[PDB]
Amino acid sequence: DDLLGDLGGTARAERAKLVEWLLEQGITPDEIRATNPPLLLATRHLVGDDGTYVSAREISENYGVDLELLQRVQRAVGLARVDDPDAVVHMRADGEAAARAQRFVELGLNPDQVVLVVRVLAEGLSHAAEAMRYTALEAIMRPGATELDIAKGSQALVSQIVPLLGPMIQDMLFMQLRHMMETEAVNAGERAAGKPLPGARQVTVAFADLVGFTQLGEVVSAEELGHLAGRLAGLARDLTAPPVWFIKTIGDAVMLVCPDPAPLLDTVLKLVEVVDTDNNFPRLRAGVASGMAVSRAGDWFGSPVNVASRVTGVARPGAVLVADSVREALGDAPEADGFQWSFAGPRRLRGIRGDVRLFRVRRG
Amino acid sequence: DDLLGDLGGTARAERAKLVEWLLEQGITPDEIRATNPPLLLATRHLVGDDGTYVSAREISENYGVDLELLQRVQRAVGLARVDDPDAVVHMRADGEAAARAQRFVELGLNPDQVVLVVRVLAEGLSHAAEAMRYTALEAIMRPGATELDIAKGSQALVSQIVPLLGPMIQDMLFMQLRHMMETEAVNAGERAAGKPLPGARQVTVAFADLVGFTQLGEVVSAEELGHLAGRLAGLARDLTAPPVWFIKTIGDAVMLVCPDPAPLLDTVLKLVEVVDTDNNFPRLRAGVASGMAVSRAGDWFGSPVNVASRVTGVARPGAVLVADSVREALGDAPEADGFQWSFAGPRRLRGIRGDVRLFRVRRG
C-alpha cells in the first residue's frame, strides 16, 4: 500500500500479508511505520500499549505526581529520556507506572532511595524481559517462517501467558523479600551507629575464570564464546548453595563470596575440578581472598575482592590459588579439614604494596 | 525468659522488652530462637511467612506441580537448596510461588527456558530486595535506637508500603516488557534461520574505569571505596540516554555499548571529562572498540568487548583511547563530527594476535 517500500521479492510478499493482518488487529498505518520490524506490534497491544501516547507534564495533571520527581524516575527507569514536559512522546501506560512512585515518598520514604529501587528494579527486570521475550520464541519460531506466521503464533501465545505474569512476579518479589537473607543483618554496632545499610563484613571472596578466553573469541564466534561462558555460568550456579553466594558473572569469569571459607573454598575447588573434566571449556583458574568487604546491591567492594581478582590473574590453569588472608580465615580447623595446602610462594601483585603469601589448594 | 541467653547489660535489657512485644505479635518462642537477630520477625509476617513451613514433596500434592520441575526452580530461585522432598523445611508461601511455574510449561514453554526466567528474575529481584530492605531503614533508623524502637517503626511502615508493591512491580514489568527495545529485534536472516535469540550484532562497546582504584582501597575503607565507585556508577547512569546502553558496572569500571559510535563515543568522552572535574575520584581512562557481539541477558560477548577491555588496561589517565575498529565504524562522517582523532600508535595487546592501531579522542 502507501507503506511497504524498499523491500524486494518474497521479502516484500510476506510483509504485505502480515501488514494487512495487523490493520485488522487495530494497528494504525502510522503505528507500523513507527516501528521496524513491525511484527510484534500485534503482541505489544497485549502488555500495555493502547496506541495512546502522552506528555511528561500531563502524566502529572492526570495521575497526581510531582513533575520533577516523575522526570527523575522516568530517567531512572532505564529509558526514554526526554527533557521537556510539554512533549507528547511518553506512552500512556508508562506514565501510570511512573506515577506510582509518589505514594512511596508520601509514606515517608527518601525520594532518592525511592529512585534507587525504581532503577535497580528496572535493570534487573529489563534483564528478565530478555529471557521472557526469547523464551516465547523457542516455542514459536522454527526455520522457514513468514513474518505473519510468527505474529499469529506469538499473538496467541502471549495472550495466554500474560495474565500469568502479574500474579507470578508479585509472589516472586515477596519470596525474595521475606527471605532477604543472613548477612543482610545489621547488628548492634551497626544499629547503635544508626546505619540503615550494613558496613564492612568479614568474608572470603573468590573468582574463577576460563584460561585463554580472550583469543578464544578471536577464533571462535561471538555466539559460540557467549554460549560457552553461559554454560559455565549455570554450571557454577548449581554447585553453589547457601551458605555461599554466587554474586555475579563478569562475562568469562565467576565471582562467589561467602562469610567463611570452607563452603566457598570447596565450591570453587569442586567447580574447577568439574571444568577440568568437561572438554568444551579451556580449564579454570581460581583466586581466593578473605577480609573486610561491603555489599552494595549485588556487588561487593573492599580489599578482599581486589586481591582475589589479582590472584586469579596469576593463578595457573587447573589451580585454585589462595591468599594468606584465607589460610587464617580458616585458622585452627576445628577437627579435620579435607584440603591440601601447598604453599605457592610470595608473589608481588599489581596494585598491592607488600606482596602476598600465596597457597595452592586441592581436594581430598 | 527461657530464651535471651549469652547477652549482657543494656544489650540484654533491650532484647527482653522487644521479645515480649513479639510474642504479642504472634511470634513463637521457637520462631525467635530460629533467627538471630529476631527484630524483623515482626515485619516478616507481613510479606508472606505465616509460620507454616512445608515439605518439598507436598508442595506438589497440594498445589499440583511436578516434583522434579518444582525442585529445579527451587534451586533456580537462588535459594534454600534441599535435596530431599520429604523434608518439611521450605516455608509454605515459597511453595505456592514455585508452583506457579507449571502453568507456563503447560502452555507450551520450554521447561528450561521457563527455569531461566525463574532464575534471572530471582537474581535481579534479590538485588532489589536489598534496595528495598535498606530504603525502609534510612526512614526508620536514627542512632541511639533500641531493638524494639526499630521493630515498632519498621512494623508500622512496611505494613503501609506493602500493598503498594504488588501492583507497582507488575506495572514495572510490563513497562520493561512493552518497551523491550531496539536491537532485541531478530531480522530476516535471523528469522529465516529459525533462531529465537538474536545473533551477533555490529556494535561499539566501551569501558571506563577509575585509575589506581586497587590500592585506593588498600588505604581508604571498603565502605568509602564502595560508595566512591557507586557515585561514578550513577554518575554514568544519567549521561547515558538511548540510543546508548549502560549495560553494567564491574565494581570500579563501567561498561557501555551502543550500535553506532558517536553516541557512545561522546558519552564516554563527556563522562571522563566530568570525572576530570570532580575531585573525590581519581581520574578515568576509557577504552573503546567496535565489532561483532551477542547480547545474552544483560551481558555482551564477542571480540569488541575483549579488545575494549584490553585497551582500557593500556589507556592513560584522562584519556579516552580507541581501537581502529571504531575509527571506521564511524567511517566517512556524513558532514561534521566534533571529535579529535590523535593517532596513538600500534600497541600489542595481551590475548590479541596482531596488534591494534590505537587512537586518542577528545571533545570539541
Swiss-Prot record, chains A, B:
Which ranges does the record mark as transmembrane?
A: none
The Guanylate cyclase domain, residue ranges: 204-312
For this protein, the record's PROSITE patterns field holds:
GUANYLATE_CYCLASE_2
Cofactor binding: number and manner:
The isolated catalytic domain prefers Mn(2+) over Mg(2+) as a cofactor.
Q: Where is this region: Regulatory domain?
A: 1-178
Protein EC: 4.6.1.1
Which cofactor is recorded for it? Mn(2+); Mg(2+)
Q: Which Pfam families match?
A: Ad_Cy_reg (PF16701), Guanylate_cyc (PF00211)
Q: How does it assemble?
A: Homodimer.
| Role according to the record | Catalyzes the formation of the second messenger cAMP.
Record protein name field: pH-sensitive adenylate cyclase MT1302
- Organism annotation: Mycobacterium tuberculosis (strain CDC 1551 / Oshkosh)
